[PDB]
Ligand binder design. Structure first.
Ligand SMILES: CCCCCCCCCCCCCC(=O)OC[C@H]1COP(=S)([S-])O1
Ligand SMILES: CCCCCCCCCCCCCC(=O)OC[C@H]1COP(=S)([S-])O1
Ligand SMILES: CCCCCCCCCCCCCC(=O)OC[C@H]1COP(=S)([S-])O1
Length: 582
């Protein structure tokens, strides 16, 4: 452990070094221009080469935290642009690093990234691949300062990948846009996931974390023994506390350590891990984290014998409540890779509650004999909601399913601003489209994965700008209750129709030719506004107005005077619609 900077440089290679160093700096020095970072990354890459050459070269023996910090404190911008972050520079490691970390801006205040036009991207990528890509890595990293830098990097490669394939196809646009689309969505899910995982530990607590991890691991590693699973829970629990409450390097090593452990112990954990364990170490923690579930062992006993029929049920649980509960979780989850983790947690909490009651009562065995019956309707409630929505998704297709949702949710919580309802409803559609393509057995974990981030960003947004007690309630509920709390929102009976504003419902020739996304958003925006303005309109009535709007758009995009048609036919569409909805 002589020269840490050389150790990493060799561990990572030059390409990954420079990328990670670029990200690391963009994440802390979020306002600085790209070229300033690129100079900081050269300076640091040049400097690191020496340490690979001569470990006893100067400064090469310094810790990474020290090097990184020294480097941050050299930037001329520091006090002017980052205020008190400059003050971290008067402190010594380890409090200097700690200080640098407390001052990172959760939400930078920056314009969004304009997806440029496909010509422009493919030309930049041809003309100057390095700068194109890295500039986008900086832009994303500065906008996502907590995003675990090696997770960013893995995205970048997929981007690059898409550009290689797509920048040389006939119809570049249609090779690439769906790839950019999926990647954008995945990238957001992924950053949102990480915010959720660190928030949820503070919020829901450590017992819940462990309960989540147990469930999750056990589905993935169903051949593993409770002992091995428990061990993994504990290290993963540590690992998450370091990645959430600590900095990059603590986390990377904590992660390489768990990965290393896992790869040494594969036969005790999973037969599915060999591809991952022969990845370069950087990718190794990631590949593991995304591995398929190992096959269940065959002929697994029913859980009745250990958890219901045994007369030691109350004794074994009392001896150690959490251990028995976790073993419950382990057994239930390894058998059910088809459940969301969170459903598995509802199940275990129902069991726990059932045991706290029954173990005190006159005849404990009799009282908890019906506990597995308590499970059926917990399991079947999300299996039925998936089925209903995926049937509907099939019928309507993504866009009209998003429109069905908008109406549903606008009537639920009509106080939510219109863009948020649009985004959220577009995102829920994207989730449907994603998860409904999986078979029934993979629907629930999928849904849990994306919904959990959709719903948590909704709650992060709404916390900032509360407009509903009902949304607050769902956002502050327990882990197991949040989603069912959302599913139980009803139509808001007390809401006062929004006032009519004719401009809102005016439309132009442009709507005929805008990009698909753009065109949808404008229509969906207006649909939200319509439900806000006419919240007691029936489905039949809203379909009538949407059928008219449809006919209006189709006519005015076939007209030769489009500008005139849109102002005149649209005047009349409005008038008709106002009379129709009283
Ligand atoms: C402001 C509007 C926000 C709307 C959010 C409403 C709740 C989302 C309902 C989505 C329907 C999809 C099916 C479904 O909910 O099941 C998902 C599984 C995954 O975790 P669980 S709680 S076991 O349920
Ligand atoms: C996944 C990569 C590493 C392997 C397992 C890591 C364990 C993750 C630790 C706990 C994460 C908790 C996040 C959470 O509480 O999710 C909220 C869910 C439950 O209902 P919904 S609203 S669908 O969202
Ligand atoms: C009563 C106040 C005035 C309201 C007049 C409102 C008419 C327009 C309302 C927004 C448009 C409804 C949303 C809608 O267009 O979606 C339906 C589908 C039908 O085919 P497309 S044109 S691809 O869009």
């Amino acid at each position: 452990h002589k020269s840490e900077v050389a150790h990493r440089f060799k561990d990572l290679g030059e390409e990954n070094f420079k990328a990670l160093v670029l990200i690391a700096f963009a994440q802390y020095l979020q306002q600085c221009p790209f070229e300033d970072h690129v100079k900081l990354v050269n300076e640091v890459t040049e400097f690191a080469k020496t340490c690979v050459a001569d470990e006893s070269a100067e400064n090469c023996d310094k810790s990474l935290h020290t090097l990184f910090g020294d480097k941050l404190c050299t930037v001329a911008t520091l006090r002017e642009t980052y205020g008190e972050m400059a003050d971290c520079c008067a402190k010594q490691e380890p409090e200097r690093n700690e200080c640098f970390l407390q001052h990172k801006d959760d939400n930078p205040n920056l314009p969004r990234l304009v997806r440029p036009e496909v010509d422009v991207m493919c030309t930049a990528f041809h003309d100057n691949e390095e700068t194109f890509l890295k500039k986008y890595l900086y832009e994303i990293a500065r906008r996502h300062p907590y995003f675990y830098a090696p997770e960013l990097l893995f995205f970048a490669k997929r981007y690059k990948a898409a550009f290689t394939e797509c920048c040389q196809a006939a119809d570049k646009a249609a090779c690439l846009l769906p790839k950019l689309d999926e990647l954008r969505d995945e990238g957001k899910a992924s950053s949102a996931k990480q915010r959720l995982k660190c928030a949820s530990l503070q919020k829901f607590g450590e017992r819940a974390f462990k309960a989540w991890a147990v469930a999750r691991l056990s589905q993935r590693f169903p051949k593993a023994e409770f002992a091995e699973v428990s061990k993994l829970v504990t290290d993963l629990t540590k690992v998450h506390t370091e990645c959430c409450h600590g900095d990059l390097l603590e986390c990377a090593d904590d992660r390489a350590d768990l990965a290393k452990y896992i790869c040494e112990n594969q036969d005790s954990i999973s037969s599915k891990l060999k591809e991952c364990c022969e990845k370069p170490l950087l990718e190794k923690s990631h590949c593991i984290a995304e591995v398929e579930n190992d096959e269940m062992p065959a002929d697994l006993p029913s859980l009745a014998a250990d958890f219901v029929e045994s007369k030691d049920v109350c004794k074994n649980y009392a001896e150690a409540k959490d251990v028995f509960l976790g073993m419950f979780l382990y057994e239930y989850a390894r058998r059910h890779p088809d459940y969301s983790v969170v459903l598995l947690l509802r199940l275990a909490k129902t069991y726990e509650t059932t045991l706290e009651k029954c173990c005190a009562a006159a005849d404990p065995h009799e009282c908890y004999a019906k506990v597995f019956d308590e499970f059926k309707p917990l399991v079947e409630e999300p299996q039925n909601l998936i089925k209903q929505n995926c049937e509907l998704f099939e019928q309507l297709g993504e866009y009209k399913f998003q429109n069905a949702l908008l109406v549903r949710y606008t009537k639920k919580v009509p106080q939510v601003s219109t863009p948020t309802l649009v985004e959220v409803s577009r995102n829920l559609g994207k989730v449907g489209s994603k998860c409904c393509k999986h078979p029934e057995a993979k629907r629930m974990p999928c849904a849990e994965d994306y919904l959990s981030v959709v719903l948590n960003q909704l709650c992060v947004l709404h916390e900032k700008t509360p407009v509903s007690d009902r949304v607050t309630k769902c956002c502050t509920e327990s882990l197991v209750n949040r989603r069912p709390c959302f599913s139980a929102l009803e139509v808001d009976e007390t809401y006062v129709p929004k006032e009519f504003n004719a401009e809102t419902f005016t439309f132009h020739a442009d709507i005929c030719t805008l990009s698909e996304k753009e065109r949808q958003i404008k229509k969906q925006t207006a649909l939200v506004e319509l439900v806000k303005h006419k919240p007691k309109a029936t489905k039949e009535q809203l379909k009538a107005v949407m059928d008219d709007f449809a006919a209006f758009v189709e006519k005015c995009c076939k007209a030769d005077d489009k500008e005139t048609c849109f102002a005149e036919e649209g005047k009349k569409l409005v008038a008709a619609s106002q009379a129709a909805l009283g």
